[PDB]
């Protein structure tokens, strides 16, 4: 079932990979943590409603590029937090509706204790999300790939 993003450019039914540009907080002191609100960014909807109850999962969520050495925490799926990068398949959620339901995922990142200057570069790669599609009619499993880029510079204030 086809998804979308804030830019409106995403992948069609069956799978694929896309790029999603998100805006972050320029400064977050160690402690107070910035919510990567993908919930306002990514959206998806059951293209085939009624008799086929859609099942959508976050199989793989990995953090590399900038975040692997920078702002990096857990991942909140429908309230339930899980360690990030995703070491296991998350508990399932369902959509089964003709409405671009918000992706109930937020990246509760956390700056490292050894953070320095501009830890996240504008345009650097922060996180990647893999989406699992299962339904109630066939054994078709499709992966949907999102590549999050922060178009902005995140630097934690640093003192001594």
């Amino acid at each position, epitope marked *: 079932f086809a998804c979308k993003t804030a830019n409106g450019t995403a992948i069609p039914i069956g799978g694929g990979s896309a790029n999603v540009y998100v*805006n972050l*907080a*320029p*400064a977050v*002191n160690v402690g107070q943590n910035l919510v990567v609100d993908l919930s306002t960014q990514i959206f998806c909807h059951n293209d085939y409603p009624e008799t086929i109850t859609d099942y959508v999962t976050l199989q793989r969520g990995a953090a590399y590029g900038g975040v692997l050495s920078s702002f990096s925490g857990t991942v909140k799926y429908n309230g339930s937090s899980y360690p990030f990068p995703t070491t296991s398949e998350t508990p399932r959620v369902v959509y089964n509706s003709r409405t671009d339901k918000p992706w109930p995922v937020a990246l509760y990142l956390t700056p490292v204790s050894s953070a320095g*200057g501009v830890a996240i570069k*504008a345009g650097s790669l922060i996180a990647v999300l893999i989406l699992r599609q299962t339904n109630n009619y066939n054994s078709d499993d499709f992966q949907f790939v999102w590549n999050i880029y922060a*178009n*902005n*510079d995140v630097v934690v204030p640093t003192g001594g």
Partner: antibody
Amino acid sequence: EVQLQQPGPVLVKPGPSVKISCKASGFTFTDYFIHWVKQSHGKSLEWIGLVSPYNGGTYYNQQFKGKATLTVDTSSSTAYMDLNSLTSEDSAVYYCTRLLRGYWYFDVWGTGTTVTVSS
Amino acid sequence: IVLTQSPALMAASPGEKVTITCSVSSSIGSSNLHWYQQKSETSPKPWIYGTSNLASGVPVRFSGSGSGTSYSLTISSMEAEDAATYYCQQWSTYPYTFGGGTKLEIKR
């Protein structure tokens, strides 16, 4: 109401510094980042740096990487801009400003000092 | 070159639409450059927080619009008052770089 204050004319010989203040009140402070801006007469207002009254953590850009010692006293909610080195050329108006946590931008600027270098 | 602006001075008769352009070295991140005014010997008052985003306490005639590589500001109507020098600040990379700015006078 919910604003910020700072001292007046701080005319001085080139010396070590001016070490001016930036007094804040009204809003729930020591929870919002604050930055600083230098305006040298009718020139660019090129931003200097930023200090965090939650933790200080202050850092500045490579241009004014030599004359900035921004800190804050939390109890009175008063930042301090201290020039590590003398200006002796940069007779510029210095502005305290703060950064809102929503749409991130500089808002509620300080009144501003007037730094003058003559002997 | 991380930011630049042109020209150094507009002008505006009352009731005249004014446009100012701020061009940047590379396409930035879309919708995050801020526009401030500074009157002479006065504290700067922010007007724009990213594209098409009025700041805290702006009129509606004042506005903005643009794209990811060259942004701009539009003041639809003029009543003097706002005669100040306006600067584009990029919330893209560190060091943040205020532009050259345009000392905007009033045209007669």
